[PDB]
Amino acid sequence: LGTQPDLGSALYQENYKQMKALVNQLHERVEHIKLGGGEKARALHISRGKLLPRERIDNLIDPGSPFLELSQFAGYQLYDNEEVPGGGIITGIGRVSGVECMIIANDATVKGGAYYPVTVKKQLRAQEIAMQNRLPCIYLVDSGGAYLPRQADVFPDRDHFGRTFYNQAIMSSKNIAQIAVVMGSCTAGGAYVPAMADENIIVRKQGTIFLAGPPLVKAATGEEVSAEDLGGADLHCRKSGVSDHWALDDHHALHLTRKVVRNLNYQKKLDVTIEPSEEPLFPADELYGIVGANLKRSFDVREVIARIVDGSRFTEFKAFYGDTLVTGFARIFGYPVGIVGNNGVLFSESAKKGTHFVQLCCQRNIPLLFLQNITGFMVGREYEAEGIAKDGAKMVAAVACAQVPKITLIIGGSYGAGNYGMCGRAYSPRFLYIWPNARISVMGGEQAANVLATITKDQRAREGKQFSSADEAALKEPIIKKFEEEGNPYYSSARVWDDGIIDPADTRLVLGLSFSAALNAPIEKTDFGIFRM
Amino acid sequence: LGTQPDLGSALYQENYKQMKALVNQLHERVEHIKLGGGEKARALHISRGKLLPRERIDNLIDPGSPFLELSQFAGYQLYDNEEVPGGGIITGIGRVSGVECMIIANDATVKGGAYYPVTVKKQLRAQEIAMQNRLPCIYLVDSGGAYLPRQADVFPDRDHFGRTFYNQAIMSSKNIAQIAVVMGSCTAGGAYVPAMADENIIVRKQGTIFLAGPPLVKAATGEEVSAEDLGGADLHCRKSGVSDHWALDDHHALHLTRKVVRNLNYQKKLDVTIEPSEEPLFPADELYGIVGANLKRSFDVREVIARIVDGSRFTEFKAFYGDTLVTGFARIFGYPVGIVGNNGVLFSESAKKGTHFVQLCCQRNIPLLFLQNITGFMVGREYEAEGIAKDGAKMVAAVACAQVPKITLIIGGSYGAGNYGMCGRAYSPRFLYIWPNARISVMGGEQAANVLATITKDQRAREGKQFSSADEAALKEPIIKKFEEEGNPYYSSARVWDDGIIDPADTRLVLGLSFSAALNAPIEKTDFGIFRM
Amino acid sequence: LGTQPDLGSALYQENYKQMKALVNQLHERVEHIKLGGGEKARALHISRGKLLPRERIDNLIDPGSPFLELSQFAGYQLYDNEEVPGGGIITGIGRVSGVECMIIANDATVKGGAYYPVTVKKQLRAQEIAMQNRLPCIYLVDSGGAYLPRQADVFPDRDHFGRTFYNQAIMSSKNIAQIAVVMGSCTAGGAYVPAMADENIIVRKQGTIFLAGPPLVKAATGEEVSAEDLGGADLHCRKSGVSDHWALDDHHALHLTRKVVRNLNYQKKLDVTIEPSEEPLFPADELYGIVGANLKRSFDVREVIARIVDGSRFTEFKAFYGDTLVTGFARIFGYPVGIVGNNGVLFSESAKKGTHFVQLCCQRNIPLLFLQNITGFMVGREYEAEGIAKDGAKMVAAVACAQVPKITLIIGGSYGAGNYGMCGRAYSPRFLYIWPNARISVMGGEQAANVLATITKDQRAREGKQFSSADEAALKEPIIKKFEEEGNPYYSSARVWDDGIIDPADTRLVLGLSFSAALNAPIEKTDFGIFRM
């Protein structure tokens, strides 16, 4: 697959310039988030002899191994006047002692490690990923408890803080190791995390564990006791017994953690056929010129596929039927993958073609990759008469029931029911990524504006009043602004709707790491519902 | 080997604090050198569509592979008022298409890529390393020619710029691939580099090659011609034939370079037995407390060995004979290594013990690792009568003739003939590294001061004049200051006397990468001279 | 590489039809040659309990293994009134007990196995192939002696019958096993073959060995003795001792041969790097439409390459310089190969480009593949002034000295010194194959006609006589006919100038088998002569 793009063409020059600017914007913002709370907080953190949260991960994972961080932009401008870089927590997938593990580390520099509502959501998403892929969980616990001013959004509900301990217990019952490294203070609910873990490590003086903190002890019983005496490694290690290992410092604790993982007695087994890897025949950075940042212009999704699959080899299925949808078999890093990508408006033929393809992949136990660039469903009286809704529902039913690993990458628009049909967040893909130029919302911003313009214009006629052209613009403008802000990738990623915003040049690497992790769990047989023919 | 150090001891606390400060100083200085010429130069460089020199290496090497940079501090404060970060050139060893290659990239942001005298020396050292280890050489050529104000130290001599082309021709005759990537302007001698290469890649518009630049053409013949017309990819690619491959941009050129290396038809073969790797039983960061920054205090070199070898396993040879020297067999990353380390003043017994050990390693084709922490030779009338010089010479003769790969790591003092006996720079070790606390000079600063104090005091008596205690201090002070400045690791590393200053915590990784690269060449049989018994 | 051809185009339709007819003609002629002497001769052969020559080979080689027959068309219309299918001998490369061996079998049904002059040449070519590639030789001996009417072209000269025994002695001295299976009568020189072999097998009653046949014994000494008594397996096996193994019938003899090869204690070792094989991305049969049968039309050789190399992956070298010649790196069945192919008339730049490429392949020990489709050298006063001859000679010198395995495939014209520069038969390529549309001669038929027309035209003017247009046609016609007959592939293949005429669709398979066999011998270092710069 693939063709050499015209580098001299003005369109390519403009597209490359716009996309490059978006990538540069993404890179520098991550640099700021990399610093966490700030210099003053970082200096205080080091002054206590503790390692910085990201240095802990560097020492924990195998030397030189890549680290797949998730949801770097959680909490980005989420709260009005509070800056919470990364949501106050760092989560990602890395290799420890040769085993792919999910790492969850609190960032004590950010608001002293307090749990904001986004912080709980990011952690719950990380636990969900580990459970689905059978990845051992490592908790680098350094937390300050729940953020009281927003307790109503942290404590009570099912997907609130309490769910964190529920996930630990369920994963433990499934033989998915839970390892807690207490590298700081953990109070109230935090003290449960080391208690719920299968194996636990606590640092000599930094680590403190207690259901009730000294402030509560004094208020309840009028006793003054230091945190170390109330908790501390020595009390738990030697008297309470809550501690399974005792560590001198952060470096020692991380060294012990690597030993614990090596004793899990786990060996990875692959259910899929493997072939030697090959690089794509075209450079990845050409994706900048091909795609650009203007969603109104259209491109061939095959060009994107040609630059991420091994050897740019692709076997298209039903090429000339439902051409607005592209499906075929390829390989990424030697893994077999079935690719479904949008190439225009969805039709009845496209939905039928997609439904057929998904059954094929499920039958052969082949992972599925979805490339979402949608613009809606075909609109017409004839199409409804032929059951376009009946056809669109078919794809949704098949995609939901599929038990093969599914990864979704939004390279453009994502609107309305087209999002559901292409394995949206609601359909539990193993991972979901978005490019910096993407847009997601219930409908396109223009459609909402035009719909309101038509509705108001008719309503004015019914009332007998007149809606002028200037009146039309006044109505449309606020709507278009609203959908632009709430469909922006940063808005979508600030809340955890996706697992990260990725540079298009990094697409192949991210997919390779993600599919590799998703293969730690055995692939189950797929059971489908009734196909409404 | 190894024992758990007393973390509570005051000595350990002081040593850790001092060593940590030295490492932090080293890290931040490298951060400044990482920026090259500066923001203005970097902005200009990018404005021309060219990649930054370090981004080129990142794209060239295999994804996620470690990169062993060499001589990061070359030119650090070497010239009075000129700042030349990294010497204007970046050299290191990385993996390209699964093959370990030596990468030599000019830094156009630094003085427009001009060749300072240190720049030539750094490049020549890189070529020397590649030839000895049979590593393919990749030249990312973006240079502005020789620095005229210092031409006398660049052009004429054997180890001056001319030697660069001599090395290319010799390496080519030995089937050590030479690949040149012209990613910019190359003039006068620079134009020879692409011409001398086995395969050559030139970017479409950035790359220019011409023996005589436009300025010389106008002066000699009074003709005005642009650099692209005089050189340029199109002229060389299609008409001159100097170019073997034509590249659209930097990304394309780097992609082509990876393809060229894959066609070398080379497969690495190991001459040494291999065993599964194991991590040391003790943390590396403990080396901070053990060693410290005070050279007057002494430590057990076995503690250093215990924290870098696989499983902290070590078979000492002649343990109770010549105890001031430690020799034994160990393994690093599964490679067999013979270790020679100082543990005090060298004696006749120590030299004999070392000479015996070196023969054993040479006989079995085992790589040698030297750990230099010297304080001199034993001084005494009896020792000279027993031929201490005759014994010290024995070790020097054996070390020089040894043909097994040799790596030297200076973890402390390096003075006088003790430097020669422990495989100094003059004895062609494959690599030479120094810790941030090291000191190297002809003799210790104090010894030079005391020697002059004794000489002057006697001379004053002969003249009949009096040399007072204040007179003694006045003489000593300038000498001690001179040896402190010129024995400093940064002074030694600014000039290319070593291949880099490394954090002690990184010692195991650096040695593993270095020994792995040194094994690309077959190990030859060792022929010794006459042993003066 | 490669593009989808226009199947609907008239040119493709015409080219496919013409080449298909040539392939059909080739196939049916081989079918006739497959029958050897004929039904009466075949019936007599079987009546004696002997296996047919091609059935013997089938039972000798491993079950289902491909057999690479050579020079199937030797002796095709070579002798005025005598039909000698295949030259009276069958030669090829096949696998015996997992070892690639050269098999040389006499065809007793053809003229009773007598040795015609072509028969000697075919056998000597097979021995040369085995010697160069270190292939064990297996002789299935069933012969009737030399053909007396043509003795002068069989016995005396260096490349005559005597050379057969010389080759056996030399190969034996180099540890290239020589195995003789006497499955019939062998007289005079034929008796030497079993005697010269390292190990020998004779059938109980069919096999007879004697320096002098019964007819000569009676004439010389007047004694009547049967062939079995004079020779026979029993006499040689038990009393003469010439026989090492005694076989009951042809099946037993073939079974013993496989055992003998299994005891050679040989294991194949590869000197080249290997990668997993991949099929080309385009169908092979499309070569019919692309190439056709008209040599005046031109095609892009890259299209031919795209349909024989693994994955249609090709790294071109000096693409835009000397574009009439195509050079690059690829892989066939996982082996590395450098491909040199004509794409027009040879120029000075093309020869310089080719000479540079050949040095690269020799340096890296990469096998070389030549695709000859030539139309001559550039003709012009300026080109001669610039030393086109000096440039053309450069390629010839490099090609001759190259020590890497070399295979040549003539896919078009082959005229003049262009043949030499592209590794003609005189330059000892390991194998030389030709497509059914090829033409080879000192110069093109038209050039010889035009040259003679010009010479006679001027000569007539000098004599004062007139050469009319009808006179020109009368002169040209016989020359064009002669060059057409002597340039035909069957003319070139009837005599052993090439190793076979192969269907283009079979090109990839034949090359894969040939390169695999050629890799049995270690690749030597190449020593070049003086390059006349």
XYZ file of C-alpha atoms in Angstrom, chain C:
533
model
C 9.132 -1.797 -6.608
C 6.683 -2.650 -9.348
C 3.489 -1.214 -10.801
C 0.270 -2.819 -11.958
C 0.362 -3.186 -15.762
C -2.538 -2.225 -18.009
C -4.047 -5.604 -18.868
C -6.533 -3.982 -21.244
C -3.829 -2.245 -23.266
C -3.299 -3.632 -26.759
C 0.474 -3.730 -26.261
C 0.123 -5.915 -23.166
C -2.360 -8.180 -24.950
C -0.030 -8.548 -27.937
C 3.079 -9.074 -25.796
C 1.366 -11.704 -23.641
C 0.137 -13.613 -26.699
C 3.559 -13.685 -28.363
C 5.488 -14.756 -25.253
C 2.883 -17.381 -24.388
C 3.373 -18.963 -27.817
C 7.130 -19.115 -27.216
C 6.640 -20.814 -23.842
C 4.205 -23.341 -25.308
C 6.725 -24.121 -28.049
C 9.439 -24.591 -25.419
C 7.283 -26.919 -23.311
C 6.255 -29.267 -26.124
C 9.809 -29.613 -27.438
C 11.010 -30.630 -23.975
C 8.233 -33.231 -23.920
C 9.674 -34.775 -27.084
C 13.199 -34.670 -25.640
C 11.839 -36.346 -22.501
C 11.242 -39.511 -24.546
C 14.923 -40.033 -25.375
C 15.667 -42.613 -28.031
C 12.044 -43.566 -28.617
C 9.466 -46.271 -27.969
C 11.421 -49.120 -29.575
C 14.624 -48.135 -27.773
C 12.742 -47.543 -24.513
C 10.980 -50.907 -24.776
C 14.292 -52.697 -25.341
C 15.868 -50.897 -22.377
C 13.076 -51.974 -20.021
C 13.102 -55.511 -21.439
C 16.603 -55.926 -19.961
C 15.288 -55.156 -16.470
C 16.899 -51.707 -16.397
C 15.220 -48.527 -15.218
C 14.789 -45.661 -17.644
C 17.385 -42.912 -17.109
C 14.903 -40.335 -15.799
C 13.216 -42.913 -13.567
C 16.635 -43.616 -12.051
C 17.030 -39.958 -11.069
C 13.529 -39.852 -9.585
C 14.348 -42.819 -7.338
C 17.748 -41.361 -6.442
C 16.759 -37.910 -5.185
C 14.801 -37.231 -2.020
C 11.024 -37.756 -2.339
C 9.311 -34.663 -3.693
C 12.521 -32.645 -3.957
C 12.857 -30.372 -7.005
C 15.414 -31.361 -9.629
C 17.273 -28.652 -11.559
C 18.035 -30.133 -14.967
C 20.693 -28.451 -17.100
C 21.179 -28.098 -20.863
C 18.011 -29.950 -21.832
C 18.440 -28.769 -25.432
C 22.031 -29.902 -26.002
C 22.373 -31.486 -29.428
C 19.028 -30.098 -30.633
C 19.415 -30.109 -34.431
C 23.187 -29.961 -33.925
C 23.951 -32.872 -36.265
C 22.590 -32.918 -39.789
C 20.617 -36.185 -39.841
C 21.135 -37.579 -36.319
C 18.712 -36.831 -33.488
C 20.434 -36.847 -30.092
C 17.795 -35.878 -27.494
C 19.486 -34.024 -24.661
C 22.925 -34.904 -26.009
C 22.580 -38.503 -24.849
C 23.151 -37.529 -21.204
C 21.068 -36.088 -18.365
C 22.684 -33.669 -15.910
C 21.201 -31.653 -13.068
C 21.339 -30.739 -9.397
C 19.167 -32.451 -6.808
C 19.080 -33.371 -3.143
C 20.280 -36.821 -2.057
C 20.033 -37.632 1.653
C 19.702 -33.914 2.341
C 22.819 -33.022 0.317
C 22.886 -31.162 -2.988
C 24.654 -33.280 -5.601
C 25.407 -33.074 -9.309
C 23.899 -36.070 -11.119
C 25.330 -37.199 -14.467
C 23.408 -40.041 -16.124
C 24.027 -41.547 -19.546
C 20.920 -42.124 -21.666
C 21.383 -45.636 -23.039
C 18.265 -45.292 -25.213
C 19.980 -42.539 -27.230
C 22.402 -44.047 -29.766
C 23.123 -46.744 -27.204
C 24.723 -44.190 -24.898
C 27.528 -43.296 -27.297
C 29.500 -40.115 -26.605
C 28.927 -37.469 -29.259
C 31.052 -34.302 -29.163
C 28.168 -32.416 -27.535
C 27.837 -35.202 -24.966
C 31.423 -34.613 -23.825
C 30.869 -30.855 -23.598
C 27.686 -31.288 -21.557
C 29.431 -33.585 -19.067
C 32.428 -31.263 -18.724
C 30.102 -28.335 -18.036
C 28.415 -30.348 -15.279
C 31.766 -31.245 -13.712
C 32.801 -27.589 -13.829
C 29.604 -26.603 -12.010
C 30.165 -29.250 -9.333
C 33.798 -28.248 -8.812
C 33.050 -24.530 -8.477
C 30.211 -25.140 -6.003
C 31.700 -28.181 -4.216
C 28.845 -30.478 -5.165
C 29.408 -34.242 -4.856
C 29.221 -35.935 -8.252
C 27.113 -39.045 -8.889
C 27.691 -40.831 -12.203
C 24.929 -43.187 -13.334
C 27.131 -44.920 -15.892
C 25.464 -46.608 -18.853
C 27.530 -45.917 -21.962
C 28.566 -47.375 -25.306
C 31.878 -45.568 -25.782
C 32.987 -42.789 -28.073
C 31.316 -42.126 -31.420
C 34.014 -43.214 -33.862
C 32.797 -41.235 -36.925
C 33.494 -38.014 -34.977
C 36.528 -39.157 -32.988
C 38.615 -36.090 -33.851
C 36.168 -33.933 -31.854
C 35.996 -36.267 -28.830
C 39.387 -37.789 -27.981
C 42.416 -35.568 -28.494
C 42.065 -32.023 -27.198
C 42.173 -30.624 -23.666
C 38.386 -30.176 -23.466
C 37.837 -33.606 -25.016
C 36.915 -36.894 -23.349
C 40.235 -37.196 -21.518
C 39.357 -34.155 -19.414
C 36.544 -36.128 -17.758
C 38.998 -38.254 -15.772
C 41.190 -35.240 -15.007
C 38.217 -33.486 -13.399
C 37.431 -36.563 -11.297
C 41.004 -36.727 -9.999
C 41.081 -33.019 -9.129
C 37.697 -33.052 -7.387
C 38.729 -36.128 -5.400
C 41.886 -34.354 -4.225
C 39.704 -31.503 -2.910
C 37.351 -33.802 -0.948
C 34.481 -33.401 -3.426
C 33.104 -36.926 -3.329
C 32.991 -38.860 -6.603
C 30.489 -41.735 -6.658
C 30.068 -44.013 -9.678
C 27.035 -46.262 -10.151
C 27.699 -48.747 -12.960
C 24.157 -49.549 -14.123
C 25.160 -50.917 -17.514
C 28.059 -51.443 -19.868
C 31.164 -49.250 -19.742
C 34.003 -49.921 -22.174
C 37.441 -48.456 -22.948
C 37.454 -44.993 -21.329
C 34.120 -45.707 -19.671
C 35.769 -48.358 -17.504
C 37.937 -45.611 -15.995
C 34.978 -43.739 -14.486
C 34.181 -46.478 -11.914
C 37.909 -46.879 -11.265
C 38.493 -43.143 -10.768
C 35.632 -42.718 -8.279
C 36.098 -42.636 -4.515
C 33.293 -45.164 -3.965
C 31.807 -47.410 -6.635
C 28.612 -49.451 -7.054
C 27.953 -52.076 -9.739
C 24.779 -54.001 -10.577
C 24.920 -57.788 -10.594
C 24.489 -58.512 -14.306
C 23.829 -55.246 -16.161
C 27.147 -53.711 -15.112
C 30.251 -54.590 -17.130
C 33.696 -52.980 -16.845
C 36.694 -53.731 -19.061
C 39.476 -51.674 -20.614
C 39.229 -53.789 -23.782
C 35.887 -55.130 -24.942
C 35.272 -58.680 -26.101
C 35.583 -57.591 -29.749
C 39.094 -56.246 -29.127
C 40.091 -59.276 -27.045
C 39.136 -61.627 -29.883
C 41.031 -59.576 -32.472
C 44.104 -59.130 -30.270
C 44.294 -62.658 -28.828
C 41.641 -64.693 -30.662
C 39.620 -65.563 -27.550
C 35.824 -65.568 -27.259
C 34.558 -64.358 -23.875
C 31.222 -62.910 -22.804
C 31.034 -59.378 -21.434
C 29.876 -60.642 -18.033
C 32.885 -62.957 -17.707
C 35.316 -60.284 -18.904
C 33.686 -57.747 -16.589
C 30.558 -58.210 -14.520
C 29.795 -57.310 -10.929
C 31.006 -60.652 -9.561
C 34.420 -60.429 -11.230
C 35.045 -56.862 -10.063
C 33.285 -57.228 -6.705
C 35.004 -60.439 -5.604
C 38.204 -60.984 -7.635
C 39.221 -57.799 -9.472
C 38.231 -55.648 -6.491
C 37.216 -52.708 -8.681
C 33.696 -52.788 -7.204
C 33.077 -51.487 -3.690
C 29.356 -52.322 -3.474
C 27.430 -55.109 -5.196
C 23.809 -54.405 -6.134
C 21.046 -56.787 -7.180
C 19.127 -54.453 -9.507
C 18.705 -50.784 -10.366
C 16.485 -50.124 -7.346
C 19.036 -51.709 -5.013
C 21.866 -49.722 -6.611
C 19.999 -46.439 -6.126
C 19.231 -47.357 -2.513
C 22.919 -48.031 -1.846
C 23.867 -44.705 -3.436
C 21.723 -42.776 -0.953
C 23.474 -44.617 1.884
C 26.908 -43.731 0.491
C 26.057 -40.024 0.372
C 24.737 -40.125 3.943
C 28.194 -41.257 5.123
C 30.072 -38.312 3.577
C 30.118 -36.506 6.953
C 29.259 -33.209 5.254
C 27.216 -30.362 6.730
C 26.314 -27.226 4.794
C 27.418 -23.917 6.330
C 26.291 -20.516 5.046
C 28.679 -17.560 4.840
C 25.909 -14.995 4.252
C 23.279 -13.454 6.494
C 19.784 -14.900 6.119
C 16.338 -13.338 6.490
C 12.888 -14.939 6.270
C 11.668 -15.450 2.722
C 8.757 -13.564 1.174
C 6.943 -13.895 -2.133
C 7.019 -11.036 -4.651
C 4.112 -8.602 -4.552
C 3.237 -9.114 -8.232
C 2.380 -12.211 -10.288
C 5.220 -13.765 -12.262
C 3.108 -14.499 -15.348
C 2.657 -10.753 -15.896
C 6.218 -10.851 -17.250
C 4.685 -12.203 -20.468
C 2.826 -8.975 -21.191
C 5.573 -6.692 -19.899
C 8.417 -8.206 -21.940
C 6.836 -9.746 -25.017
C 8.924 -11.115 -27.872
C 9.895 -7.917 -29.747
C 13.414 -6.770 -28.870
C 12.972 -3.386 -30.575
C 10.456 -2.357 -27.924
C 11.888 -1.409 -24.536
C 10.701 -2.121 -20.998
C 11.754 -1.081 -17.506
C 13.964 -3.769 -15.984
C 12.685 -2.685 -12.564
C 9.409 -4.374 -13.510
C 11.259 -7.668 -13.972
C 13.046 -7.204 -10.641
C 9.798 -6.431 -8.811
C 8.458 -9.882 -9.720
C 11.386 -12.067 -8.592
C 12.765 -10.509 -5.378
C 11.341 -11.088 -1.907
C 8.478 -8.711 -1.159
C 9.425 -6.694 -4.257
C 11.858 -4.783 -2.035
C 14.827 -3.168 -3.767
C 17.375 -0.587 -2.607
C 18.680 1.131 -5.727
C 22.258 2.418 -5.835
C 23.119 5.579 -7.783
C 19.605 5.730 -9.197
C 19.930 9.049 -11.046
C 23.502 8.550 -12.321
C 24.053 6.424 -15.405
C 20.343 5.664 -15.510
C 20.730 3.233 -18.424
C 22.060 0.738 -15.849
C 20.170 -0.421 -12.753
C 22.017 -1.608 -9.641
C 20.738 -2.296 -6.144
C 20.416 -4.693 -3.238
C 17.639 -7.234 -2.724
C 16.997 -10.714 -1.344
C 15.865 -13.895 -3.111
C 14.515 -16.676 -0.886
C 16.256 -14.879 1.981
C 19.679 -14.693 0.324
C 21.338 -11.295 -0.237
C 21.924 -10.416 -3.889
C 23.224 -7.451 -5.860
C 21.403 -7.004 -9.159
C 22.866 -5.383 -12.279
C 20.475 -4.893 -15.176
C 20.507 -3.090 -18.514
C 17.947 -0.356 -19.149
C 19.315 1.052 -22.389
C 22.622 1.673 -24.097
C 25.761 1.555 -21.971
C 27.453 4.903 -21.350
C 30.608 6.000 -19.571
C 28.581 6.855 -16.469
C 26.839 3.472 -16.537
C 30.148 1.592 -16.667
C 31.583 3.715 -13.852
C 28.422 3.112 -11.827
C 28.626 -0.630 -12.468
C 32.308 -0.819 -11.548
C 31.597 0.958 -8.260
C 28.739 -1.427 -7.459
C 30.753 -4.588 -8.149
C 33.427 -3.493 -5.676
C 30.745 -3.017 -3.017
C 29.324 -6.519 -3.490
C 32.789 -8.094 -3.482
C 33.733 -6.238 -0.295
C 30.637 -7.466 1.561
C 30.679 -10.965 0.001
C 27.258 -10.535 -1.624
C 26.279 -12.770 -4.571
C 25.813 -10.982 -7.890
C 22.964 -11.345 -10.390
C 23.190 -10.001 -13.945
C 20.199 -9.291 -16.195
C 21.459 -8.818 -19.754
C 19.268 -6.856 -22.133
C 21.805 -4.955 -24.204
C 21.706 -2.994 -27.450
C 25.363 -1.911 -27.621
C 27.643 0.858 -26.402
C 27.227 4.564 -27.043
C 28.653 5.523 -30.441
C 30.094 8.998 -30.898
C 33.280 10.941 -31.443
C 32.960 12.692 -28.075
C 32.404 9.445 -26.165
C 35.576 7.907 -27.601
C 37.471 11.114 -26.811
C 36.325 10.722 -23.191
C 37.536 7.110 -23.057
C 34.291 5.154 -23.293
C 36.485 2.155 -24.096
C 38.547 2.987 -21.010
C 35.284 3.040 -19.046
C 33.838 -0.130 -20.563
C 37.069 -1.992 -19.844
C 36.776 -0.970 -16.186
C 33.559 -2.959 -15.772
C 35.024 -5.952 -17.611
C 38.070 -6.041 -15.332
C 35.960 -5.792 -12.172
C 33.483 -8.458 -13.296
C 36.222 -10.936 -14.205
C 38.066 -10.621 -10.885
C 34.949 -10.813 -8.692
C 35.034 -13.950 -6.537
C 31.428 -13.790 -5.283
C 28.989 -16.239 -6.920
C 27.709 -14.802 -10.195
C 24.571 -15.805 -12.100
C 23.661 -14.315 -15.478
C 20.189 -14.254 -17.037
C 19.780 -13.084 -20.634
C 16.297 -11.563 -20.893
C 16.927 -9.835 -24.233
C 19.675 -8.946 -26.672
C 23.310 -9.849 -26.034
C 25.690 -8.262 -28.532
C 29.348 -7.295 -28.722
C 31.429 -6.126 -25.779
C 28.224 -5.436 -23.858
C 28.025 -9.192 -23.367
C 31.471 -9.245 -21.741
C 30.714 -6.351 -19.402
C 27.586 -8.129 -18.142
C 29.276 -11.436 -17.215
C 28.978 -13.428 -20.410
C 29.781 -17.112 -20.686
C 33.487 -16.312 -21.063
C 33.571 -14.781 -17.563
C 32.688 -17.979 -15.642
C 29.335 -17.163 -14.033
C 28.159 -20.027 -11.854
C 25.085 -20.362 -14.080
C 23.863 -18.760 -17.297
C 20.194 -18.877 -18.294
C 18.326 -17.355 -21.230
C 14.681 -16.524 -21.832
C 12.974 -17.901 -24.957
C 12.997 -14.430 -26.570
C 16.751 -13.866 -26.216
C 19.246 -13.183 -29.005
C 23.044 -13.395 -28.824
C 25.727 -12.674 -31.424
C 28.793 -10.531 -32.057
C 26.465 -7.737 -33.187
C 22.824 -7.269 -34.053
C 21.725 -8.722 -37.359
C 20.704 -5.303 -38.660
C 24.047 -3.709 -37.761
C 25.957 -6.364 -39.706
C 23.646 -5.831 -42.682
C 23.911 -2.034 -42.539
C 27.688 -2.172 -42.064
C 28.101 -4.401 -45.119
C 25.731 -2.174 -47.097
C 27.861 0.889 -46.331
C 31.123 -0.927 -47.097
C 29.929 -2.333 -50.424
C 28.300 0.978 -51.369
C 31.564 2.884 -50.910
C 33.606 0.085 -52.489
C 31.408 0.152 -55.599
C 31.941 3.912 -55.862
C 35.712 3.427 -55.627
C 35.581 0.857 -58.432
C 33.232 3.233 -60.252
C 30.480 0.611 -60.398
C 26.968 1.272 -59.098
C 25.269 -0.555 -56.221
C 21.505 -0.265 -56.635
C 18.821 -0.396 -53.960
C 17.909 -3.885 -55.158
C 21.631 -4.611 -54.890
C 21.564 -3.442 -51.266
C 18.598 -5.688 -50.444
C 20.253 -8.695 -52.088
C 23.329 -8.168 -49.909
C 21.456 -7.539 -46.653
C 19.005 -10.439 -46.850
C 21.420 -13.395 -46.403
C 23.218 -11.706 -43.493
C 20.013 -10.973 -41.575
C 18.896 -14.579 -42.038
C 22.238 -15.922 -40.793
C 22.275 -13.811 -37.628
C 18.654 -14.734 -36.921
C 19.436 -18.458 -37.105
C 22.667 -18.288 -35.081
C 21.279 -15.878 -32.477
C 18.233 -17.997 -31.734
C 18.059 -19.378 -28.170
C 17.771 -22.944 -29.474
C 20.907 -22.473 -31.579
C 22.728 -21.101 -28.533
C 21.370 -23.849 -26.268
C 21.855 -26.796 -28.650
C 25.533 -26.074 -28.283
C 26.296 -25.608 -24.612
C 26.598 -21.830 -24.410
C 24.008 -21.554 -21.622
C 22.735 -23.832 -18.873
C 19.160 -23.871 -20.155
C 16.205 -22.052 -21.651
C 13.760 -21.266 -18.862
C 10.175 -20.075 -18.806
C 10.028 -16.502 -17.441
C 7.381 -17.533 -14.905
C 9.973 -19.962 -13.489
C 12.721 -17.346 -13.117
C 12.402 -16.901 -9.348
C 12.435 -20.643 -8.651
C 15.427 -21.324 -10.908
C 17.434 -18.487 -9.364
C 16.558 -19.667 -5.862
C 17.746 -23.199 -6.595
C 20.903 -21.975 -8.335
C 21.940 -19.553 -5.586
C 21.254 -22.196 -2.939
C 23.574 -24.648 -4.705
C 26.237 -21.998 -5.325
C 26.402 -21.299 -1.579
C 27.801 -24.764 -0.813
C 31.280 -23.380 -1.365
C 32.835 -20.742 0.907
C 33.130 -17.267 -0.590
C 36.737 -16.212 -1.133
C 38.257 -12.751 -0.879
C 38.421 -10.835 -4.156
C 41.752 -9.599 -5.525
C 41.453 -6.904 -8.188
C 43.866 -5.867 -10.902
C 44.905 -2.322 -11.674
C 41.936 0.002 -12.165
C 42.835 2.196 -15.140
C 41.415 5.419 -13.713
